[PDB]
Enzyme design. Structure first.
Site, short mmCIF file in Angstrom:
data_model
loop_
_atom_site.label_atom_id
_atom_site.label_comp_id
_atom_site.label_asym_id
_atom_site.label_seq_id
_atom_site.Cartn_x
_atom_site.Cartn_y
_atom_site.Cartn_z
N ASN A 46 0.73 -1.31 -0.19
CA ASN A 46 -0.02 -0.01 0.02
C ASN A 46 0.87 1.28 0.02
O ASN A 46 2.04 1.12 0.67
CB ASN A 46 -0.95 0.25 1.32
CG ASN A 46 -1.70 -0.95 1.60
OD1 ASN A 46 -2.58 -1.31 0.50
ND2 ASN A 46 -1.70 -1.69 2.59
N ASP A 48 0.94 3.72 1.71
CA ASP A 48 1.38 4.22 3.05
C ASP A 48 2.38 3.65 3.87
O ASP A 48 2.84 3.52 4.85
CB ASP A 48 0.14 4.38 3.93
CG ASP A 48 -0.65 3.13 4.23
OD1 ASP A 48 -0.35 1.98 3.65
OD2 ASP A 48 -1.61 3.21 4.71
N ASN A 59 -4.41 -5.65 6.15
CA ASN A 59 -3.45 -4.71 6.22
C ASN A 59 -2.56 -4.58 7.71
O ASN A 59 -3.05 -4.61 8.75
CB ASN A 59 -3.61 -3.38 5.80
CG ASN A 59 -4.67 -2.53 6.81
OD1 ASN A 59 -4.15 -2.16 7.68
ND2 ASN A 59 -5.84 -2.33 6.44
#
Length: 129
Positions: A46, A48, A59
């Site tokens: 991802n 971030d 996640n």
């Protein structure tokens, strides 16, 4: 491992997902199909710095700790590598925690976009369960 559809449905049923917080079993099977194509080894990084792991693409920012995500909250209290195993128990026990959030299964945007609202009972059709 990559699960067959009815093989996954039966594993999920035995772990208590049918009608968990109002979601019938086909929701969870459809979510796993569009999240990972039933592959326990799926991972996606991802934007971030967190990564999504396993059959339901959980996640590392909020739910599991992989050692490399700064500030992982690890709300499921599990290493993210536990989410990559052939045994889906840790993935579904964690999935129940994220589905307990205010927006339920909307936390999975592949479910929200490809599964939500359709006749999800099709995903368990033909499975002796």
């Amino acid at each position: 491992k990559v699960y067959g559809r009815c093989e996954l449905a039966a594993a999920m049923k035995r772990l208590g997902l049918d009608n968990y917080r109002g979601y019938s079993l086909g929701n969870w099977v459809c979510a796993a199909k569009f999240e990972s194509n039933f592959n326990t080894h799926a991972t996606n990084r991802n934007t971030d710095g967190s990564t999504d792991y396993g059959i339901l693409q959980i996640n590392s920012r909020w739910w599991c700790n992989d050692g490399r995500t700064p500030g992982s909250k690890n709300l499921c209290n599990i290493p993210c590598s536990a989410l990559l195993s052939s045994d889906i128990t840790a993935s579904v026990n964690c999935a129940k925690k994220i589905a307990s959030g205010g927006n339920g299964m909307n936390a999975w945007v592949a479910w929200r976009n490809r599964c939500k609202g359709t006749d999800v009972h099709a995903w368990i059709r033909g499975c002796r369960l």
